[PDB]
């Protein structure tokens, strides 16, 4: 028995450091020597009740690189099931009989958690409920800051953008807070700053953090620079433009930057990272996205295997 066999992986704070460490170490491994027919003969469901094709094409290639078969759907208010009146509970109750693992994204929160109550023995991977968890993204964010920095501890890691509603930076902080040292720099518009329940948590485990106005005051100290979009509607048409440019990253700013330093972005970007950064060696968002394959493979293999032979 694996520590994750039959487990439903729904949250990042559902996991412990030691199996986060088992997810990462395994990913590094399958990346090294691929296992093409590991999940041969297993049938997996890609239930995207909420369309999102960048998470879907990633997940679905990951099933396939391990030899699994895929049945599923991108719903856009038209899928007969889990729609007319049929409860999402009763949809999972009939999917759970013909597949071997459900993958699931949905608009409402705790959807995957509800699925867990009706899937029975079937594991549920949560591709993102709503405003709540998307642990597979976080498991590819940590796999990338470690594949490049060589460690998940005692690092300087900046967090740029909409830090209030930015669930992707919320949950990268909680997972990195299970490791030691680790400095945090939050650069955010006055009004979209990091919510203070995370800052509360950061202080109880005694983690070091600052608050900054721009990437201008942060750049020579920084190992990771996790970038994220600031939405126009969240600020004020004028307040948006005055502060806007402090949160854009052209390559001009990559002057003081350390050699190790990596610019990561959850994607899709629009304009807060400029095309002259893509050439620079510190740009690693496209590779961050490629590694998502490796992190999502690992969950699929641990969850559907006892004897993991790699």
């Amino acid at each position: 028995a694996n520590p994750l066999y039959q487990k439903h992986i729904i949250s990042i704070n559902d996991l412990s450091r030691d199996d986060l460490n088992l997810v990462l170490a395994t990913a590094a491994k399958l990346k090294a020597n691929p296992q093409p027919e590991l999940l041969k003969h297993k049938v997996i469901a890609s239930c995207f009740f909420e369309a999102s094709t960048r998470t879907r094409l990633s997940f679905e290639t990951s099933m396939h690189r391990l030899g699994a078969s895929v049945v599923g759907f991108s719903d856009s208010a038209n899928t007969s099931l889990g729609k007319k009146g049929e409860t999402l509970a009763d949809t999972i109750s009939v999917i759970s009989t013909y597949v071997d693992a459900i993958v699931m994204r949905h608009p409402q929160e705790g959807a995957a958690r509800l699925a867990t109550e009706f899937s029975g023995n079937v594991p549920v991977l949560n591709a993102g409920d709503g405003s709540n968890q998307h642990p597979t993204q976080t498991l590819l964010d940590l796999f990338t800051i470690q594949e490049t920095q060589g460690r998940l501890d005692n690092l300087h890691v900046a967090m740029v953008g909409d830090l209030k509603f930015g669930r992707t930076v919320h949950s990268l902080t909680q997972a990195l807070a299970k490791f030691d040292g680790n400095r945090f720099y939050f650069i955010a518009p006055d009004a979209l700053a990091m919510p203070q329940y995370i800052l509360d948590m950061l202080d109880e485990k005694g983690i070091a953090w600052s608050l900054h106005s721009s990437i201008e005051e942060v750049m020579a100290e920084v190992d990771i620079l996790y970038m994220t979009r600031v939405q126009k509607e969240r600020l004020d048409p004028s307040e948006y433009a005055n502060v806007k440019a402090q949160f854009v990253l052209r390559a001009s700013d990559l002057h003081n930057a350390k050699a190790n330093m990596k610019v990561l972005h959850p994607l899709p970007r629009v304009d807060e990272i400029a095309t002259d950064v893509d050439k620079t060696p510190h740009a690693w968002y496209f590779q961050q996205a490629g590694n998502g394959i490796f992190a999502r493979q690992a969950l699929l293999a641990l969850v559907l295997n006892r004897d993991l032979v790699l």
Binding site: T87, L88, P107, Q108, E109, G110, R113, G130, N132, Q133
Partner: protein, 146 residues
């Protein structure tokens, strides 16, 4: 202290205008036998608080810690064998099941056949209650409007 049958579980001293509510949320009327409902009297350590006994039941220790965020202080002193042989008083539990509703409008628990469940926290200062399903930690005064 008012007129009531020997033997059952006595529930006592409920605070200002609760009591009907407690009979509403924990469903104490479904399981029949004489339900001596006191209500709107003067009583112990108060002189204006609600209270009520039942016959034949026997609420568990976890069954009584459920009251906690509604009364705290409230006797539930069993009238065992023949008479009042076993005192109690709720503190605050580790998990309040059913009863309360998530204030997040977009929770799946408003749409489903699922039992509502909040993990309890902060022994006092501002008791926080996170949802099982959407993992949002709201204040207890906020969930307690319902």
């Amino acid at each position: 202290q008012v007129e009531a049958i020997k033997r059952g579980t006595v529930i006592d001293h409920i605070p200002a205008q609760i009591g009907f509510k407690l009979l509403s949320l924990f469903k104490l009327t479904e399981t029949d036998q004489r339900i001596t409902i006191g209500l709107n009297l003067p009583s112990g350590e108060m002189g204006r608080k609600d209270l009520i006994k039942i016959e034949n039941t026997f609420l568990s220790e976890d069954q009584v810690d459920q009251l906690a965020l509604y009364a705290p202080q409230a006797t539930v002193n069993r009238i065992d064998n023949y008479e009042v042989v076993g005192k109690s008083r709720p503190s605050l539990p580790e998990r309040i099941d059913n009863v309360l509703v998530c204030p997040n409008s977009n929770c799946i628990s408003h749409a489903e056949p699922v039992s509502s469940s909040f993990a309890v926290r902060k022994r006092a200062n501002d008791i926080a209650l996170k949802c099982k399903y959407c993992e949002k930690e709201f204040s207890h005064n906020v969930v307690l409007a319902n």
